[PDB]
Amino acid sequence: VLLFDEVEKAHPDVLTVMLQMLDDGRITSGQGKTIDCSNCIVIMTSNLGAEFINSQQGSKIQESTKNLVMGAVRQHFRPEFLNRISSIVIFNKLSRKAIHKIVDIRLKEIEERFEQNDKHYKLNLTQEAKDFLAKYGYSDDMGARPLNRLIQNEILNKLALRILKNEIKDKETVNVVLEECLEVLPNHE
Amino acid sequence: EYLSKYAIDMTEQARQGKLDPVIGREEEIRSTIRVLARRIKSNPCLIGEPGIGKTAIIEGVAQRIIDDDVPTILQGAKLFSLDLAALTAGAKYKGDFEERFKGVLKEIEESKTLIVLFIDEIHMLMGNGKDDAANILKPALSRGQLKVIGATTNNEYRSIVEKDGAFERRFQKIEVAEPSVRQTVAILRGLQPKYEIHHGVRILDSALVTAAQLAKRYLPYRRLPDSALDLVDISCAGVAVARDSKQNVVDSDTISETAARLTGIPVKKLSESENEKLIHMERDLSSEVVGQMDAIKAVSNAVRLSRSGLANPRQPASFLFLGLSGSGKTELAKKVAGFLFNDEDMMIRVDCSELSEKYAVSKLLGTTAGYVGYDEGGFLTNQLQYKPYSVLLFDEVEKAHPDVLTVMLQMLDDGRITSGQGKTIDCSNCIVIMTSNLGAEFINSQQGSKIQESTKNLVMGAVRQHFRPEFLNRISSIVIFNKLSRKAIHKIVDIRLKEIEERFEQNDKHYKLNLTQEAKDFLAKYGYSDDMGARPLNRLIQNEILNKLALRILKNEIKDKETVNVVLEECLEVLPNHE
Amino acid sequence: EYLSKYAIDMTEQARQGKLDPVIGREEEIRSTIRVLARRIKSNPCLIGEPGIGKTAIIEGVAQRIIDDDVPTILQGAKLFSLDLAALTAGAKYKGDFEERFKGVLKEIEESKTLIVLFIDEIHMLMGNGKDDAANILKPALSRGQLKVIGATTNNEYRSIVEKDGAFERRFQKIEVAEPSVRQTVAILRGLQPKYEIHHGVRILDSALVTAAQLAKRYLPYRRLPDSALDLVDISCAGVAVARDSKQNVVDSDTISETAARLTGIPVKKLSESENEKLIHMERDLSSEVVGQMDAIKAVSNAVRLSRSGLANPRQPASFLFLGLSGSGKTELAKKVAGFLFNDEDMMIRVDCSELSEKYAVSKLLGTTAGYVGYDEGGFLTNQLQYKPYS
Numbered sequence A: 001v002l003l004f005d006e007v008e009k010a011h012p013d014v015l016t017v018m019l020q021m022l023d024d025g026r027i028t029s030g031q032g033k034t035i036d037c038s039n040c041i042v043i044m045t046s047n048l049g050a051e052f053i054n055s056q057q058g059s060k061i062q063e064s065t066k067n068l069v070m071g072a073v074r075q076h077f078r079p080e081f082l083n084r085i086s087s088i089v090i091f092n093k094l095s096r097k098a099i100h101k102i103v104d105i106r107l108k109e110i111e112e113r114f115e116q117n118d119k120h121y122k123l124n125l126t127q128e129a130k131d132f133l134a135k136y137g138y139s140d141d142m143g144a145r146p147l148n149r150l151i152q153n154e155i156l157n158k159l160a161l162r163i164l165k166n167e168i169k170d171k172e173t174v175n176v177v178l179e180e181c182l183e184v185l186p187n188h189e
Numbered sequence B: 001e002y003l004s005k006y007a008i009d010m011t012e013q014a015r016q017g018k019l020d021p022v023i024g025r026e027e028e029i030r031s032t033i034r035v036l037a038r039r040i041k042s043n044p045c046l047i048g049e050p051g052i053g054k055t056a057i058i059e060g061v062a063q064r065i066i067d068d069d070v071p072t073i074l075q076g077a078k079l080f081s082l083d084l085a086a087l088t089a090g091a092k093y094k095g096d097f098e099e100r101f102k103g104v105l106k107e108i109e110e111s112k113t114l115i116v117l118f119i120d121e122i123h124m125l126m127g128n129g130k131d132d133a134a135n136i137l138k139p140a141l142s143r144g145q146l147k148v149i150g151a152t153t154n155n156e157y158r159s160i161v162e163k164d165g166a167f168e169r170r171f172q173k174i175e176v177a178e179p180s181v182r183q184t185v186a187i188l189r190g191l192q193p194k195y196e197i198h199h200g201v202r203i204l205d206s207a208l209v210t211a212a213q214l215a216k217r218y219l220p221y222r223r224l225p226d227s228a229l230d231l232v233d234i235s236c237a238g239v240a241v242a243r244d245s246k247q248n249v250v251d252s253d254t255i256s257e258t259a260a261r262l263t264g265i266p267v268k269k270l271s272e273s274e275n276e277k278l279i280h281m282e283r284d285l286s287s288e289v290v291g292q293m294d295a296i297k298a299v300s301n302a303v304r305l306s307r308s309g310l311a312n313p314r315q316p317a318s319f320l321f322l323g324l325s326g327s328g329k330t331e332l333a334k335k336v337a338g339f340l341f342n343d344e345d346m347m348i349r350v351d352c353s354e355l356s357e358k359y360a361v362s363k364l365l366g367t368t369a370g371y372v373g374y375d376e377g378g379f380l381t382n383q384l385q386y387k388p389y390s391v392l393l394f395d396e397v398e399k400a401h402p403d404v405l406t407v408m409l410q411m412l413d414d415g416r417i418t419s420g421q422g423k424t425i426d427c428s429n430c431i432v433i434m435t436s437n438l439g440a441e442f443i444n445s446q447q448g449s450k451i452q453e454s455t456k457n458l459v460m461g462a463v464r465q466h467f468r469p470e471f472l473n474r475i476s477s478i479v480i481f482n483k484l485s486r487k488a489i490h491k492i493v494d495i496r497l498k499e500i501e502e503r504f505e506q507n508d509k510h511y512k513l514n515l516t517q518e519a520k521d522f523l524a525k526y527g528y529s530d531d532m533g534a535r536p537l538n539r540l541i542q543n544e545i546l547n548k549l550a551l552r553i554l555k556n557e558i559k560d561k562e563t564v565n566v567v568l569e570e571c572l573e574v575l576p577n578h579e
Numbered sequence C: 001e002y003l004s005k006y007a008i009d010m011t012e013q014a015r016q017g018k019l020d021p022v023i024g025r026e027e028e029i030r031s032t033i034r035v036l037a038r039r040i041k042s043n044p045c046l047i048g049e050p051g052i053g054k055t056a057i058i059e060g061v062a063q064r065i066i067d068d069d070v071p072t073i074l075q076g077a078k079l080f081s082l083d084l085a086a087l088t089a090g091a092k093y094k095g096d097f098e099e100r101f102k103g104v105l106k107e108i109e110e111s112k113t114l115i116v117l118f119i120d121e122i123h124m125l126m127g128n129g130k131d132d133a134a135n136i137l138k139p140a141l142s143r144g145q146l147k148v149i150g151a152t153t154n155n156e157y158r159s160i161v162e163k164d165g166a167f168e169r170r171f172q173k174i175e176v177a178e179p180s181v182r183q184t185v186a187i188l189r190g191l192q193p194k195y196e197i198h199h200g201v202r203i204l205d206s207a208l209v210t211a212a213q214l215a216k217r218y219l220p221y222r223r224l225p226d227s228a229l230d231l232v233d234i235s236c237a238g239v240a241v242a243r244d245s246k247q248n249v250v251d252s253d254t255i256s257e258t259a260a261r262l263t264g265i266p267v268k269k270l271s272e273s274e275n276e277k278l279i280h281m282e283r284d285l286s287s288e289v290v291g292q293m294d295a296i297k298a299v300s301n302a303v304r305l306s307r308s309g310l311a312n313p314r315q316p317a318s319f320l321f322l323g324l325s326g327s328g329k330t331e332l333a334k335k336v337a338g339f340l341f342n343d344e345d346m347m348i349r350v351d352c353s354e355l356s357e358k359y360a361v362s363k364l365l366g367t368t369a370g371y372v373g374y375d376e377g378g379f380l381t382n383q384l385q386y387k388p389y390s
């Protein structure tokens, strides 16, 4: 899989090369060899449509709203490029409904990525922690990014300190007031 | 026999138990077996990055042959490696090595059961215009004779086959995978007794795991089969050294410390008795800079997260510091570098004012192959490959032209910052601080020394109206500095005077001040700028106090312990050649 | 014994002494040893910038080896400095140097205790298109004992491994770096008797300190061991001349005059004539600057701060001269240079009406990588490299 991060920023000369790679596949090397990329999947990304998606006109992007986005992609990129893409997909807004599910996923991935995959959460407050994060992390026009940051800001930062103080082994738990915070394990570890 | 002179009987080394075992790699071994079992052109070649076990795999099949876990074609086999000596022994007497090589190949084909030749570093035979290659193996391999096993690096291969053609025809490349972390541990475990025996140490399973985990995360320039072993082997050596330098059980901490010594990642020192500093780094930073506690706390958490290992393995800490000039934005970054490595010059500074979107991206990451110049990326590439745990500072990012701000996106996300020569940095161990004065517009609304809502949001307004959201969304925390309060100024003056006094290399050059509050209040009254912050305190001191000192030194009116007095216009007293 | 025709037996020299003491490098040495003590990849490298003790480390470990202050594995090991003719003796006939390299490794590999090579300049082997081009002759056997300690700067290192790809998977980089200023002094101190003996002069302990501090605050292009040692050696040579003329390295005067000679920077010379220096300048300037004493004093104040060290080492003094057109402020800047250097034309200047967003930064500091024109430093650093204090 090839990934091109923010193709809208690439100078057009680049895109010009990619035109062959994306269609026909005979990208060649600087030394004169033919590579042939046709067995790859290519994903290119850009944010031009953000300017219209932020209008909140649908979670799933609505007709017209999508055309505003297509307007921008056509204004920015040569059609020679756009025509060669198998498909242009306009992402949906991550609605509050979505954030509820996303919170779950992120909490799980946070545990999964630990090196010390011992220090898991219990969380408690399934509905309250989920809701706290779902509400406070819902900066819709920033997608799910704020959520990740919220969890970091409210849970992990505190956790790290509690760890330095040996206040936690595992099964970490969350309380809420009113402001989401962490508890301690009386048994230092 | 020439094989006894220009080759190594790998089968015999395996027979004698002198080779390390191959752990798994069944798909690769099977692939080489199938190729060796071919009717024609039975010449597999292992292609992959260096350090992934290619040679080991071939030694692996030698072991399968030793124990008859191979096809009958291979059961009768003897495997020899080819020494470079076939050629490197010299070509005086033109054609001498050509004959030596022709000779050994003759002996290999000639009757004596199945002989398999392993040629390590197969690109060795590219040949200067071929000729030295002498294509001696070429027609031989084309007849299905001399089964040859090759092995080389992805790009070495490229330089062979794309400069030859025949190589691609003569060999069947087999990609060798880099093992997963889980597999890596299994490999280490399999090799563990070899190390335990060699070093005279015990290795615990958590050690094996630790090496594989740390290696993937902290040794990005070396593939797991080696990186994990390097951590184990070196840690074990550390035990051996320790014993002889004046118990022998290698564990996770043993390795973590070792890794820190090799990678520079301070997290892995695991010096928990130093948690006092990490826990209280907020007070420590507050002893150098005054107030601005939100910035201190924001940073402190970056550090604590990294120390705890909780920090996202791919997301360098990132900050955007907003506020008045003289607010302490840069000063804090210096003190962070100070705290983390006991060195304010540890910092890698990039001055964004020198940027130009038409040129300057290359100042950080360099240019690509072809364009004039190389030693690329003086600011980032050539620093980050040496000090992954350093603090980067990007001064005045709001002045950066957009293409540079675009570069920052890699840095602030994943850390996989690419380099002009097609290489990657992977700066996930980094802490990155950026500064900006966009907020000057609203922070100088003076709506509380501690900036309040609305005003703060207007600061974010300026940020949002300047930087693309794509950038802002990658900042761990955007921090708006507070305007210094008069009280802060007082404290700053005290600390700043302390720094100045401490700075002297000659212990005559100091003050007692007198006017223990009054001198400081003068400095505040005459240096408390709502739009220059503390910076004028530095200048005020230099002009009204240190120049008077310079005059006093010059005229020998001051010896030491100088004191301050005030006109109406702060001035200094005289402590002449009496002392 | 091919090795004996090409390499220097560092162990034998250490056995006979004839080596400098090694100061503060114990940990680089411990790391070197630890890697050498490894089961397989026992190939450490001393890496940094020139003049940072990379070969000092080797003399150091050679001495630790002589005294059995090394692990079992190294207890009886020997070490040889090779490179050199190993790659050039074979000036004719294909495969000749290649044979030597191989013969040397053979000599090392077989029986004769543990022999460790020291490669002073691994980049010289490089692997010039691989295909038997020297460095490439090694890798086959990098596992087979043949332990070797390498050495290279970071630029050289990066060039090698980027072009090669295998060495960075075979060798263990050890960071070697310049010492702190105090550590530098300890080094200078350690070599102090060497210089004192060869020049027949004494070095004041305070001269060692001055050289260390000075180098840190004087020569940004030279790493502290060499930089401070050169300040010491250069000074010692000057003292030796005084000794011969009819002594010691004077912390204040030998080093300051040496430094003043080598670079300049009025601050590093600091004249003793305090009754007039930094006083008379206001009168001299007053004659040039009639009435506007305010500017003179502003400048004089900064000048006075730089002298005797009140000025902050990282804050070049600087002024903005605002005022009535035709005030004479440009000449003032020159007249100040007059006093500062006894040279009104010492300065570097830029016509700012020539500056534009399209090019100005590069006109001032030079273009960057890949762009036309390598007049590095443009209008400014192009000149600062010659006169840092102008």
Ligand SMILES: Nc1ncnc2c1ncn2[C@@H]1O[C@H](COP(=O)(O)OP(=O)(O)OP(O)(O)=S)[C@@H](O)[C@H]1O
Residues within 6 Å of the ligand: B020, B021, B022, B023, B024, B049, B050, B051, B052, B053, B054, B055, B056, B057, B151, B152, B153, B187, B191, B225, B226, B229, C040, C166, C169, C170
């Ligand atoms: N079972 C195994 N799987 C993978 N690697 C192993 C295994 N056993 C040992 N190793 C070590 O893995 C390292 C990889 O190096 P080698 O395979 O010898 O060299 P390489 O991987 O072929 O890369 P080059 O081309 O020799 S730099 C070796 O140092 C082996 O000691």
Ligand SMILES: Nc1ncnc2c1ncn2[C@@H]1O[C@H](COP(=O)(O)OP(=O)(O)OP(O)(O)=S)[C@@H](O)[C@H]1O
Residues within 6 Å of the ligand: B288, B289, B290, B291, B292, B324, B325, B326, B327, B328, B329, B330, B331, B332, B395, B396, B435, B437, B492, B495, B496, B533, B534, B535, B538
């Ligand atoms: N809160 C503070 N505590 C102590 N010293 C401070 C503080 N704020 C500013 N200073 C002084 O201000 C000087 C550097 O201040 P900064 O505000 O970081 O400079 P700066 O304005 O960041 O420069 P920039 O970032 O390019 S505008 C130092 O010499 C500090 O002594």
Ligand SMILES: Nc1ncnc2c1ncn2[C@@H]1O[C@H](COP(=O)(O)OP(=O)(O)OP(O)(O)=S)[C@@H](O)[C@H]1O
Residues within 6 Å of the ligand: C020, C021, C022, C023, C049, C050, C051, C052, C053, C054, C055, C056, C059, C120, C187, C190, C191, C225, C226, C229
């Ligand atoms: N402890 C020491 N022992 C020997 N030499 C020292 C020592 N400390 C500093 N030096 C100086 O450093 C020189 C050799 O040390 P290095 O700093 O490695 O020089 P170098 O850069 O290794 O030499 P090359 O060949 O250019 S790498 C000596 O000639 C001394 O002048």
Ligand SMILES: Nc1ncnc2c1ncn2[C@@H]1O[C@H](COP(=O)(O)OP(=O)(O)OP(O)(O)=S)[C@@H](O)[C@H]1O
Residues within 6 Å of the ligand: C288, C289, C290, C291, C292, C324, C325, C326, C327, C328, C329, C330, C331, C332
């Ligand atoms: N206050 C002063 N400071 C310095 N020089 C002065 C002053 N008053 C008169 N002069 C004389 O005026 C002449 C110097 O003039 P210039 O410095 O060329 O003019 P200028 O005002 O610097 O032009 P600028 O700076 O580009 S507006 C010399 O001959 C000085 O002696």
